[PDB]
Amino acid sequence: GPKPGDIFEVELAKNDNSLGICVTGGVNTSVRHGGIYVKAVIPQGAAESDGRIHKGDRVLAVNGVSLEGATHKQAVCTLRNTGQVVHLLLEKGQSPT
Ligand SMILES: *CC(=O)Nc1ccc(/N=N/c2ccc(NC(=O)C*)c(S(=O)(=O)O)c2)cc1S(=O)(=O)O
């Protein structure tokens, strides 16, 4: 799989055009790599069931848009204003940085 600090792309179906995942960080605030960290993944959802996502990993860009520096609210707004499948780069947030 992707190594710690390795950038990987994943495609996830937003599932019934609505997702409702959660995040934290963004504005380079307290969280280690300043990124959006996946604060919570709902179970039974696309993110969980597809397994391209887990808590602790961080989102880099959403649909191309460099999301780093974007706020935690803007993070999810950006995940909303996607198409059917969400293309978004993650970086492993396992890395104790
Ligand atoms: C999921 C969780 O634990 N916390 C959470 C979830 C969602 C939000 N804010 N969502 C949101 C969605 C859309 C927009 N604007 C658009 O036009 C796309 C906004 S904004 O306008 O406020 O940027 C926000 C917040 C939170 S929080 O953890 O309570 O911040």
Curated annotation (Swiss-Prot):
This is Tyrosine-protein phosphatase non-receptor type 13. Residues 9-93 form the PDZ domain. The gene is PTPN13. Interacts (via the first PDZ domain) with PLEKHA1 and PLEKHA2. Interacts (via the second PDZ domain) with TNFRSF6 (Fas receptor) (via C-terminus). Interacts (via the second PDZ domain) with TRIP6 (via the third LIM domain and C-terminus). Interacts (via the third PDZ domain) with NGFR (via C-terminal SVP motif) and PKN2 (via C-terminus). Interacts (via the second or fourth PDZ domains) with PDLIM4 (via C-terminus only or via combined C-terminus and LIM domain, but not LIM domain only). Found in a complex with PDLIM4 and TRIP6. Tyrosine phosphatase which negatively regulates FAS-induced apoptosis and NGFR-mediated pro-apoptotic signaling. May regulate phosphoinositide 3-kinase (PI3K) signaling through dephosphorylation of PIK3R2. Belongs to the protein-tyrosine phosphatase family. Non-receptor class subfamily. Expressed in keratinocytes (at protein level). Present in most tissues with the exception of the liver and skeletal muscle. Most abundant in lung, kidney and fetal brain. It comes from the Eukaryota. It is found in: Cytoplasm, Cytoskeleton; Nucleus; Cell projection, Lamellipodium.
